[PDB]
Structure formats: C-alpha cells, structure tokens
Design a protein around this ligand. Sequence first.
Ligand code: MG
Ligand code: MG
Ligand code: MG
Ligand code: MG
Ligand code: MG
Ligand code: MG
Ligand code: MG
Ligand code: MG
Ligand code: MG
Ligand code: MG
Ligand code: MG
Ligand code: MG
Ligand code: MG
Ligand code: MG
Ligand code: MG
Ligand code: MG
Ligand code: MG
Ligand code: MG
Ligand code: ZN
Lengths: 185, 37, 139, 141, 130, 135
Amino acid sequence: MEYRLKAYYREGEKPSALRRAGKLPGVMYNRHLNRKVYVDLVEFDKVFRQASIHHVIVLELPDGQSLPTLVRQVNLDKRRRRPEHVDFFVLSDEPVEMYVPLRFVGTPAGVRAGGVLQEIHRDILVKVSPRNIPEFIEVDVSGLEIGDSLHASDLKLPPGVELAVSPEETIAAVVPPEDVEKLAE
Amino acid sequence: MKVRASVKRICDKCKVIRRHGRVYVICENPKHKQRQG
Amino acid sequence: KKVVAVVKLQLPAGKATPAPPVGPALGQHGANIMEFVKAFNAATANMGDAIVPVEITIYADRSFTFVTKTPPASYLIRKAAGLEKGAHKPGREKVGRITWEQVLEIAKQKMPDLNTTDLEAAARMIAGSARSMGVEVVG
Amino acid sequence: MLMPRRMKYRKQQRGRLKGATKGGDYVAFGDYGLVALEPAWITAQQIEAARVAMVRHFRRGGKIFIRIFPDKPYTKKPLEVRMGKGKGNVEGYVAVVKPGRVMFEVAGVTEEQAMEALRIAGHKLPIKTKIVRRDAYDEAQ
Amino acid sequence: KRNVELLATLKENLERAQGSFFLVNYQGLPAKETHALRQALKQNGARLFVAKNTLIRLALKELGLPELDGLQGPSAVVFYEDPVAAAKTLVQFAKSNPKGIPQVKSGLLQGQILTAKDVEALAELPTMDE
Amino acid sequence: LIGFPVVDIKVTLYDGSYHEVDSSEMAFKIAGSMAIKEAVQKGDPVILEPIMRVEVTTPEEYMGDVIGDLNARRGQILGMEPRGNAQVIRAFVPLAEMFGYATDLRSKTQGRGSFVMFFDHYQEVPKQVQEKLIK
RNA sequence: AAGUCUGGGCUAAGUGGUAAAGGAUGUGGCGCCGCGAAGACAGCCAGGAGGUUGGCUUAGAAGCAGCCAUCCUUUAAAGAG
Ligand SMILES: [Mg+2]
Ligand SMILES: [Mg+2]
Ligand SMILES: [Mg+2]
Ligand SMILES: [Mg+2]
Ligand SMILES: [Mg+2]
Ligand SMILES: [Mg+2]
Ligand SMILES: [Mg+2]
Ligand SMILES: [Mg+2]
Ligand SMILES: [Mg+2]
Ligand SMILES: [Mg+2]
Ligand SMILES: [Mg+2]
Ligand SMILES: [Mg+2]
Ligand SMILES: [Mg+2]
Ligand SMILES: [Mg+2]
Ligand SMILES: [Mg+2]
Ligand SMILES: [Mg+2]
Ligand SMILES: [Mg+2]
Ligand SMILES: [Mg+2]
Ligand SMILES: [Zn+2]
C-alpha cells in the first residue's frame, strides 16, 4: 500500500520511439519542479492497477532520489484503450487535494429486494495531508431502499481530511433493476 | 448431421474435431453432430 | 416362491392400502400387507399423522418383517411453533418461533437416528432445519 | 424507440466517419462496457434490440446504461424515383459511432452474466465490439 | 501450497498427542458400514479417534518430522491411521479386527503400528488383541 | 362474440319510466333485450369452452405416457388411484381436445387402457384460441 | 532481358492467385495468472454419506418443473446436488 516504481529521465527521444520500446512517456512536476520521464509500461501497469490515483507511488530515479508522488492524469489513446502518457504529481509536506477510495459497507434494503446499487462515486475529492492518506473510507449503505440515496454530506471523514466538493453532491443511489416484465410496452 | 457456418459445442459431451480440412463436432448425442459447411 | 428381499419404504400415516409401493416390491414377501395397517397405526394412532419410516425383509417361507424410525425434523417442529404448514417463502416471513431449549428437546427426540451422538451438534441440525423452513429460533 | 423530442432542423448532411471516438472512450457508470471496434451509424432499432437483449438475459435484473443516442436523422428517397426533385424523407434516426466508444454499460450483475449479455448485444450490432471491464484507467478520467 | 500445510499441523497435533498410533486400509466399506466401524472405535477407543485418515504423503512428513520412529510399515495404498493413543486403546485392536475380519471380504485391514513408541509388527499387532 | 348463449351473470334491474298510454308489454321486452345486448357487449365479453372430467384406466406401465398425452392435450390433471390393478388417472381436459381419444389412448396403452369422460364445467378459452374463433 | 542470389522467419492452404458477420484443439510466437514430487493434469481403484421427502407450490415434484433458502452433521470427502 506504499508503492514503488522505477522511473527514468527522457530528453529528446520520440514518444513514438519510447512507446514502441515498451516504455511509457511521462512527466513529473510540482510548483518547484518539472521533469520529463519514462517508465516501463508493464511495470507501471502492475503498480498502477492497484495504486490508481489513490495511493502514493514512489519514483526511483537513476540519480538515486526517491520521489513520492500521486498519479494526477493518465492519457489514453482512444482507439486502442491503452495509456500513452502519465502525469506524476510530486508530493510535498503541505496538504494536497486528492481522491479517496470509498468502500461501500453493507447490503441495502433496496438490493436484496430486487434492485441495484449504483455507486455514482467510487471515490471522492479530499483536501489532506500526504502524511495521512486514508487508504479507504467506509460508507454504510445498508439503510438504502430502492429510490433512496446518499450524498457527500453524509460520509464519515477521518481526521483530517476535509471534503473537497459540495456536500450537495450525491455519491450512491439504489435504483430499480431491469424487468423483462417491464418490456412489452 | 447439422451443416452450418456456426458449429459449436452443444452440450458437455460435445467434441470439436478437425477432419481432412473440415471442422466437425462429434458427440454421444446424435443431434449434436455438426459439420462446418 | 420369490427371493429374499431388503425393501425400504416411506408411506405416511393412515393410508394403509396395498397399492404401490406396497404391491410390486411387496408381492415378493407373500406379505400380510394389511397387517401393517394395524401394526403401524398402533404406534401412530395416539399421534395420528407423521410419516414413520420402515424396512421390510422376507426370507424363505414367505413372511414379512418391518421396523420403523422417528417422525421428520420438519414434522416435530411444526406442532411446537403453532403451525399447520411451513412458511411459503423461507426468508421474509417467519410464521412461528422456538427457544434454544425447545429445539434441544426436539433434538432429543431424534437422537437415536442421526450421524452425531450429541446435543450441541444435534440442535444446530434442528437449528439449520428451522432456517430451511423460515421459522426463527428464539435466541 | 429513441429519437429527438425535437430538432432545430429535420434533415442533415451526411458528414463523415474519420477518426477515433471524440470522447466517450472510458467506462463511467457500470462495471462492464461494450466498445465499438469500428465506425458505423448505429441505428436506433439496433440500439434498441441490444438493450432488449440484455434485459431479456438478466430477466430481473440489474442496470443497463446507454451511452450513445441516435440523433442523426437518416434520409431516404422513395423507391423507384429518380435523382433530383430534392432531398429524401427522414426514415429513422441513427447515432454516429467511432472505434473506442463505449456504447452500453452494465452494473449489478454476475461477471458471467455481464459478458454473456454483452456478447449478445454485440451480435445485434453491425460492427466489431470488444467487451471491457472497469479499471483504474477509467477512474483516472 | 497449500491447505496441504494446515493438515501437516493437524496430523502433527493429533500425533503429538500420542505415542501409539496404528494404521488401517479403510477400503471398500460403504457409508452405512463406514459410520459403524468408526463409531465402533469411538466407543472402544476414547475421544473421537477411530481413524484420522489423511494423505500418506504427509503422515510420513508427520512421523518423519517428529522423528516418531519413521513408521515405515508401508504407507503405500489406502492408509488411514488408527490413533490408539489419542484414545485409550490396548487390546482395542480387537475392536478393529472383529468389525473387519467378518463384515466384509477383509474389512478394516491392519498394516503398520507402533506401541509405546516402539514399532509393533504386521500380524504381530493384528494378533496383539487376539 | 360468436353468438353462443350468455351464462354466469347477475342481472340487476333498477331505474325506469312508463306511460299510461304509449307503453306496453312488448315495449318492455325490447327494452330488456336492448339493455342486455349492450350489457354483455360493453363489458369485456369472453368465450368459454366446455371442460370434461376424465378418467383413464391404465396398466401402470403406461402411466406417464398417458399423463404426458393428457397435459399435451391442453389438459390439467387431478390425481391417481389404483383399481383392478390397473390404475386410474383423473383429469379436466377441454372437450375440444377429446375427439377420437380412444385411439391414441389405445396406442399409448397398447390397447389395454380405457376411459369414461363427462362434462364438468365451462371456462375461458385461451386468449390465443378465442380470437381465432371470432371468424 | 537480368539471381533457380545471400542471411533470419513464417505458411501446407496451390493459401499465394477474389468477399463479410461469425465459427474452429490449424500453426507459430508473446504475456498473465493457476495446480504440481507436501505427487498436479489424464485414465483407472474406494467412497460420494446423514438430519431430509429441506420449506413452499400441482394431484406428485423425494438433490436435478419451478418459487424461496442453501444451514447442519459424521467426516479424508461429499453441494439442500
Ligand atoms: Mg497494458
Ligand atoms: Mg447456430
Ligand atoms: Mg464421442
Ligand atoms: Mg454526402
Ligand atoms: Mg461532426
Ligand atoms: Mg443502415
Ligand atoms: Mg431514368
Ligand atoms: Mg435521401
Ligand atoms: Mg407523402
Ligand atoms: Mg457484430
Ligand atoms: Mg479492457
Ligand atoms: Mg472529459
Ligand atoms: Mg535461393
Ligand atoms: Mg531463405
Ligand atoms: Mg479452401
Ligand atoms: Mg493458387
Ligand atoms: Mg485461389
Ligand atoms: Mg492463432
Ligand atoms: Zn453433445
């Protein structure tokens, strides 16, 4: 849950040359720094598929530095469903704005009754110190029946960790379930 | 024998064979007998 | 003069007519087939209902021999929870209830039929058999 | 089936299928997705069939989302007339789709269930289409 | 790799609670005659230890790894181990040899056994209650 | 629907008027009919067909085959008892499906079974039968 | 007219030398998890069992019409099949 990934420095190499040779063009930045980097596709993919934009990844640069980051954006080539480039946010002791996995706890009274829980948000936006990223945030959705929902305004929130979006924003809902009976009409 | 462009395993004993350039399906049940054609 | 057989039946209470399975598999006994109407409804006429199991053996001079078990899990529990039937849909509607120590005494009725020979093991069988029907156990 | 409630204009010129999906490329709602492998005006009765497939599979049921909507009116001249005398009569609606688009999404359903539905839905469509499942890459968008 | 481990512990446990474990080739017995000639050694061999049958492969890594006199009877074939010491047995090997040398064509067939901690024998173990 | 008798209804009479002069006995007959001819027309009419209470007597070799035929003839089975041993199977099948039965029965029972059959009641022919009949 | 030219690889259909949805133990090459000498996969030798016909539902649905539930027990194991 505190990931590492090798990360090297590119200068003038073509993104195409790189992408070809199994590597992933990328950039790492923050308000003090900006640097063009590549990672091995397959290695990033292994990490990233667990980490996502949620958990720190740590960049082992050839120079020996050990940058601790967050994946900010990841550009996909739309034709091939694949990653072309990654944005690496280099974290700092200041608090930071980022995304927290929401784990939905419990089975609703609306599921189990025929229907369906639509997790609108699977995570949420959060202002927070890097030093306390709550790798999780549990929400109880057992009280939800069909036609019921749940907004940010709920949501327990460890400390601290304040929200970062309107609490007016809805986050899960239970909606009714595709009926073949509903069909003929 | 069934003769179609879609030859498939129909039940759990259905067997897919390649014979003399042709894909067949062969099975205990004889309705299942396909030939690709 | 038909063979030595080991027959296994399941007939309920009352209906003691010599029709299948009391006929083809029972002709091989030369059975006093109607001696069961009276030698069965004599342990089950104070009771009335209850399927009571039975094994019927024949030998070499054409006579029959049968010995019975004890009324079903599902049966014993139905007349302890104020019920005629089960619960239609096991899950959302319980139509009776039973304490931890009324299942034990039901578990004490079925003690010489089972796999275990215990009470805590046995009563959870009764307990699982209450979930099978949808009658909550008064715990 | 599907079509616009209202339109600013009733017939439109034909345009062109160059290129990958403009957007709409990542899964947003459900757990599984059906992505178009090729360009095609998918027609509404098509979309509709695909839906009906999946509800019929699920029976009851989960949730199907539809991410393409047919809003291009399709013209056609009446049979056996000649060129000229104006543009033809709108006959139905279609949705312009380019490879990488996610067309339909499913949620609340077994993994076996999803794939099989999606398999069927593809069969009702005039193009290649791989099934996809929600990833990290999707939620990074 | 695998649950094969939490059964070496099992058999280690039930072996490290004894010193006189026998072994039988519990072959052809049905289910009706199985839960008999097993409650049999549960009302003749204390606790609930008739046979603890488990993979010979591991019950030689069991006897092997406690050294437990490397029970080399021949843990080939159907091999089921009669914990006669996780019980209270003695001439209770007769509890075995009656149910089996009658209720079959060879019933609870005896193979290897080691009493106190000394390796018993073949028929001399099978005649150790007759 | 197809001009067969109307059965199974409750005819409530209430309001009305008269004339010491114009009105008559005949003049009220026509009133009643016109009333009823619209009653049974404006209220979801439906075609009932007859249904027979059937007993088939079969050597029980033949049980399933027979019940099989029975359901397949749009029937609905009621139960099974022994007789001359021999067996008996009771059923409601629509009469429309009992034509020439004796011969399938004899085929399905090796010419060893038999049957009796009686009108029991009427009921709503299937929505997919009814509207074929309306020709 | 000029190489039966050189080195690596594939293809077995005369594919090359006429086409699509789709279908396939064709053939090669990758990659990812999985089980495996604490003995896997294949065959084959045992067992595969109780409470229990689970409750409900038809006249009967006894593991296998179908609607619920899917526990418990001896157990090496064994599903309310
Ligand atoms: Mg990849
Ligand atoms: Mg086909
Ligand atoms: Mg074969
Ligand atoms: Mg044009
Ligand atoms: Mg455009
Ligand atoms: Mg078209
Ligand atoms: Mg012309
Ligand atoms: Mg036109
Ligand atoms: Mg016109
Ligand atoms: Mg298609
Ligand atoms: Mg994918
Ligand atoms: Mg966008
Ligand atoms: Mg050459
Ligand atoms: Mg060459
Ligand atoms: Mg060819
Ligand atoms: Mg050629
Ligand atoms: Mg050719
Ligand atoms: Mg290939
Ligand atoms: Zn087959």
